[PDB]
Amino acid sequence: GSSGSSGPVGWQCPGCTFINKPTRPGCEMCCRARPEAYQVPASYQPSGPSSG
Ligand SMILES: [Zn+2]
């Protein structure tokens, strides 16, 4: 495969290669379901704001 290809986050749509957030199991462009094969880093958050 590719040596050191971490790149940006999110799973690249297996159809439109649309780097979709690691929290969105679906696509936005071709709304093509997320490829189960892919792997998401458990214990992940949308990085929401805090401190009111
Ligand atoms: Zn897509």
Distance from residue 16's CA to the centre of ligand 1 (Å): 4
Q: Please enumerate in sequence order all residues whose Cβ is within 8 A of that of 13, keeping only pairs 6 or more positions apart, or say none.
A: 19, 20, 27, 29, 30, 32, 34
CA of 33 relative to ligand 1 center, distance in Å: 8
The one-letter amino acid at 38? Y
State the Cα–Cα distance between residues 20 and 49, nearest whole angstrom. 21
How close is the Cα of 28 to the center of ligand 1, in Å? 6
Q: How far, in Å, from the CA of 6 to the mean position of ligand 1?
A: 20
Distance between CA atoms of 17 and 8, rounded to whole angstroms? 13
Question: How many angstroms does the Cα of residue 5 sit away from the middle of ligand 1?
Answer: 20
Strand partners of residue 20: 11
Token duo for residue 23: 């929290």
Give first-to-last CA distance, the chain, whole Å.
45
Going by the DSSP 8-state scheme, the letter that residue 11 receives in this structure is B
Rounded to 10 degrees, what is the CA torsion of 17, 42, 24, 27?
Answer: 20
Burial class (CB in 10 A: 0-12, 13-18, 19+), 48: exposed
Chain position carrying tokens 């199991």: 25
DSSP reduced 3-state for 22: coil
Q: What experiment produced this structure? A: NMR
